Symmetry: D2
Subunit: 249 residues, 4 copies
């Protein structure tokens, strides 16, 4: 019952294999009533049954690059609930092709789109969410170790996640006095790139990669009152990978 009576919005549920789904499954089981967005009709058809499974509801189309799209979603939530207890931001994009390259070869267009969709979107969603969380709440986003250290084939996404993590802290200072907490989970890679997985599997302290159910439980903590004195935190849920400085010999 850690989220009994709580109402939350999850952005980014695209399928039943994602972190967002892990979070939705755990939050729902913990008592949360959940609202879900989608982008495009194809995704809507995928999300509807997932929402039903969790006794949640689909609150509308959201393109985070479209300001009016975001306003419509929050207007719908305001009408249905009047208040919001938490928000999960599991959204990020970067050009698949340019990930394999050298960071220095990225295009301006990919850089800008990555920053907008993967970083600015959290700030945009939070600006609209603030009015609905007058009582307090919890905002969670997702990040990755590539923000801190150079990881192959993460390139601009690493730069973006570094920006995101810094924004989590600035947001935490802005919203702290209203008791809205803002935190990130730094998730290890998830068996759902084969190089990054295997590397984690053999070198992470726990000798396995993490699952969406595990990231889900860590999200539950950060979303619930158990974490009511935690804000501005980048929380590693990665089998301890982030602490190693070199392979064992």
């Amino acid at each position: 019952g850690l989220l009994y009576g709580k109402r939350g919005l999850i952005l980014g549920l695209a399928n039943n294999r994602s972190i967002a789904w892990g979070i939705a499954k755990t939050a729902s089981s913990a008592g949360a009533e959940l609202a879900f967005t989608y982008q495009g009709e194809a995704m809507k058809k995928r999300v509807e049954p997932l929402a039903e499974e969790v006794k949640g509801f689909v609150c509308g189309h959201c393109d985070v690059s479209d300001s009016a799209s975001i306003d419509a979603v929050f207007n719908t939530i305001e009408k249905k609930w009047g208040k919001l207890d938490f928000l999960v931001h599991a959204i990020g994009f970067s050009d698949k092709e340019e990930l394999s390259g050298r960071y220095v070869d990225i295009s301006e267009s990919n850089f800008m789109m990555t920053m907008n969709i993967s970083v600015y979107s959290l700030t945009a969603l939070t600006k609209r969410a603030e009015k609905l969380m007058s009582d307090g709440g919890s905002i969670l986003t997702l990040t990755y170790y590539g923000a801190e250290k150079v990881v192959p084939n993460y390139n601009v996404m690493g730069v973006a996640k570094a920006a995101l993590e810094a924004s989590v802290k600035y947001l935490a200072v802005d919203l702290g006095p209203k008791h809205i907490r803002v935190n990130a989970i730094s998730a290890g890679p998830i068996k759902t790139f084969r190089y990054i997985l295997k590397w984690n599997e053999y070198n992470a302290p726990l000798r396995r990669t993490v699952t969406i159910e595990e990231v889900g439980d860590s999200a539950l903590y950060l979303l619930s009152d158990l974490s009511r004195s935690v804000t501005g935190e980048v929380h590693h849920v990665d089998s301890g990978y982030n602490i190693i400085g070199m392979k064992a010999v």
Copy 2:
């Protein structure tokens, strides 16, 4: 029921105002059966009623500088339980007088004692606990922001906590293959020169309040439970976000 059926050892319960007590109260209420050590008769008399209140038990005198003393405690636990699921290290010492001074004026003797009691003790306890510990167990210690940034009147304790945090990571790698997790909570100061540190946190922490032992308790619960099963080597800030500010705010 987050600790249903679990058995744990808490070192450092000295009174009903400490973090250890907050942790005991929450862990017990989540289903844990708890064993408690003490140092000296005066403390024993204070700890006995606290132990009874939580339906735990007092497992003996422990001086963490005394190797045999540590062996006796773990022998008592082995005889009573045969296994240990988690261990809480809320132990630390440094010369009260030398805290007010300049770090450079500390005595060799204070330095050595601080390192032994506040740092080495975790490693000594963990070495002995390893044989008893269930696959999937959890070891938690306490640290403070003074390990990361210079905080007035923390001096050698800051240096010691920096060592402790590093030891958490080395321990996490050693015990990771047995799935024993090792983490630290970096607690904010708690309303219990020190008045200055409290007030400063109160006005400048993002959440505009200092944290309580019940709050640190709930964060401990998360780290001790299966909710955090993919988290190891972590220094987790439970400090109202104070650690993220760069200036009076």
Copy 3:
């Protein structure tokens, strides 16, 4: 003087006036033996930069708007024609909306965010892409950052978020170019007297109990630009009287 940049040729972007870190770097680098090239943006700045370049025996290589790809190409073409090779590059460029700095970070506009990211972050990557071809021999690329990238500082807001992105990009670039022995580093400068709150706060709380000057940042830049620092890359180097290490008012 010290001869640490004897025979070296470098490009400095961002010299707007004689009070900036860029000028501190130019003055020290020139005295250390460097021949320097300088860009400008717009005719007003050109008139300010020309005499500064003359004072340092350097030369003005043209108009550069870092948001304009062809503008950047023209500058590097000019440098290639004159020198054929480049030993170092200083990126002292950054912009954010002055009005939105005073606000809450959460109230920033999408437009300010995007422009700040482009001018303050992406520009280093754009400049480095062009510079790579001219630094076949190896070289040093230096940018500027600030503690607001690491901790929350009042009225830095989106610039803090941008500088965190910049610092991360320095590391990714350092990995890309490391095998060609091009180093990429940043100086995290303390604030400089030439915002009054940020100065005074540093002055009273920094370990050294004073703020830093452009000449001091200049000498730290010299180190990073010279062969003295030939095994240093991906580094965010604090030149701030130690301010970054304090956890509380003194």
Copy 4:
């Protein structure tokens, strides 16, 4: 040469041979104009190195022995009256226990490591403070094992974490007297260890391991007036290894 330490006088602790970081620092500092004093705990090996650099041997120093430290600083005070900088290239941990698991270390190794590798900087600095009334620079050495878990480093990693923190506390104490305190985090140097070298060689951004002459030049910077606004800094001189998050 560059004259960056013209007229400056410095004490280097830890010169044990001509392959060490201390030697790289001595060579560069001397060539930049410094007169250098050297301790030993080894005398025969240090004497010719000291002569080569036009420096002098100021005596036996066991950093665990308080009187030993006092005698050394008394000798420096009599000879010079003032000290411009100090290099702390001292560290010890039990060679055998490095190969093991961190959790298996002995109390005795732990305590000795903390004393010789960490407390010694504080002890030396306490004495050095009185001689640096004009200001100065204090430099120690560390390694990435202080920040992330690295093979074969164990209690030394824990110790170096302590050292780095002590650098910052010392920087705050001595900052108002304009004494700067910094550390260089050096990469491993070609001088299981073959594996650590090769790993850095193939995965460090610069694709090579660093040399004592390179660490020397970085030391020169931190010891000189070029770095007069830099204190409390852990400076990586490791071909950028510290920034990578995975095999290349």
